[PDB]
Amino acid sequence: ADLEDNMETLNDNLKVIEKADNAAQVKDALTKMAAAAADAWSATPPKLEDKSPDSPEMHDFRHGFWILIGQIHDALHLANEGKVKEAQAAAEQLKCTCNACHQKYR
Amino acid sequence: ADLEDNMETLNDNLKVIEKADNAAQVKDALTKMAAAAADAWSATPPKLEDKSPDSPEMHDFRHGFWILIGQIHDALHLANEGKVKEAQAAAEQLKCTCNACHQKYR
Amino acid sequence: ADLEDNMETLNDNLKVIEKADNAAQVKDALTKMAAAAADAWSATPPKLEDKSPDSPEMHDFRHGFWILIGQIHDALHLANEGKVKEAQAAAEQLKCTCNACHQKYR
Amino acid sequence: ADLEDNMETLNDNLKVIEKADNAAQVKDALTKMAAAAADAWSATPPKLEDKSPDSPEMHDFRHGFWILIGQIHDALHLANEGKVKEAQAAAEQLKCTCNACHQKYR
Ligand code: HEM
Ligand code: HEM
Ligand code: HEM
Ligand code: HEM
Ligand SMILES: [Zn+2]
Ligand SMILES: [Zn+2]
Ligand SMILES: [Zn+2]
Ligand SMILES: [Zn+2]
Question: Which GO terms describe its cellular component (chains A, B, C, D)?
Fold first, then answer.
């Protein structure tokens, strides 16, 4: 659905990964994050409402999702390999991307 | 919207890139493809209708979109640098990904 | 060592993947390709000997190795998950990048 | 050459990026970092000397370099586009990867 709901599922599932005991829990959480990130692709954030869909800001905004999506992808492979700690570490590294976009556009 | 519509916009814009004379045309077409690929993320193809969203087939199906999205991302950077020929070559390389998914799931 | 030798190991191991019966064989081959691709990074091809290391051609040449390295990395994740067929398909998709560089610079 | 020398050039060039006033400076520094990261690929860190090259630790160590290499690649596209501030931000995000590997293996 909307940007806020997608952001909520990203946040909820990042916390799930942080507290996870097994690979299945991490895999499920990352799958849901992948779907939320993909669904958020086309959203226009409130702070960029006055800007063109083709503006440098909107391109940069969408670029952040490219980065997040790529990171979720790789973290899911690590989880699929049963590498819980490695996948959790990869999910922690996702935060740098979360935080970078929030700093600019939230 | 639906899978078929997203595939049409992928195909339309790939052709635009092949026939393009300037970077602006390639940039615009790749941007459209990126949106279409992200929107297609969550779709269930007709041939996998009987399968679980968590089946090996559906994970592999979605994985192909991860690959496509990554390739579109890189091609847009080359287009942004004004490297028309390089971006066109990158777009041609996308076809390997198109064809690979079609052969399995179309 | 030298570009030719790295290319030999890339080609040899690609063929090993094609003929492989299990994931261990694919994993081993892809690990060898990863090392060869990384070692090839800083090589200057005969056809670009007259060009500056900072030339558009040399940047483009190195870029092709980034692409190849990224694809080997993902294919190895698939092999690590025991997805032999998927990893073999991924390795087949590597050829598009092999061929693209050879057409321009070999 | 050796791991320590590669780390020095990574560190020196990261600082250059942080203090840079032009895209050319950032481009040059990122190119050097890419070469150093590629060269570090096959190194065995002192803390993993008693481990097999096929150990989980060595796989994870090498994985960190793939991640770094991917991020340097993206950052260089941004610099090539003349987006100094975006490239500098991308280089800052590299630190997350530097720091993550150091915490585990330094
Ligand atoms: C896993 C990574 C991420 C997490 C955990 C996350 C989490 C959140 C949370 C909890 C909110 C607040 C929702 C609310 O109550 O209003 C939010 C808002 C927001 N996020 Fe993220 N986020 C992530 C990645 C990103 C990325 C990559 C972008 C941009 C590329 C982004 C852009 C935004 C924007 C623009 C808002 C404000 C939404 C609004 O006001 O409607 N986020 N995020
Ligand atoms: C740029 C690359 C691609 C192009 C140019 C392309 C093009 C097309 C076209 C023209 C159609 C027929 C649409 C119609 O009239 O019904 C189609 C269908 C389809 N494509 Fe793609 N495609 C691409 C990428 C992909 C990828 C990466 C996947 C899988 C991950 C995929 C999966 C499918 C499926 C499952 C259908 C069947 C849709 C249906 O019958 O309802 N495509 N594609
Ligand atoms: C997995 C894919 C690849 C395969 C199977 C492959 C295989 C080969 C083979 C069989 C040769 C000729 C044999 C030799 O002289 O050693 C060669 C040479 C060469 N390759 Fe590739 N290669 C691959 C990837 C690449 C990529 C991505 C690039 C560009 C970035 C590239 C650039 C070159 C160049 C410039 C030569 C000529 C070197 C010379 O003759 O001194 N190759 N490779
Ligand atoms: C751009 C990111 C990075 C920067 C700026 C950086 C910088 C440094 C510096 C300044 C040192 C101390 C000098 C030395 O003794 O080598 C060092 C050491 C080291 N780094 Fe990094 N590094 C980065 C990335 C990484 C990554 C990704 C890994 C692992 C995947 C890693 C593993 C190590 C190890 C094992 C040492 C200790 C080796 C030794 O000195 O005996 N570094 N790094
Ligand atoms: Zn990975
Ligand atoms: Zn690129
Ligand atoms: Zn993958
Ligand atoms: Zn990018």
Answer: periplasmic space
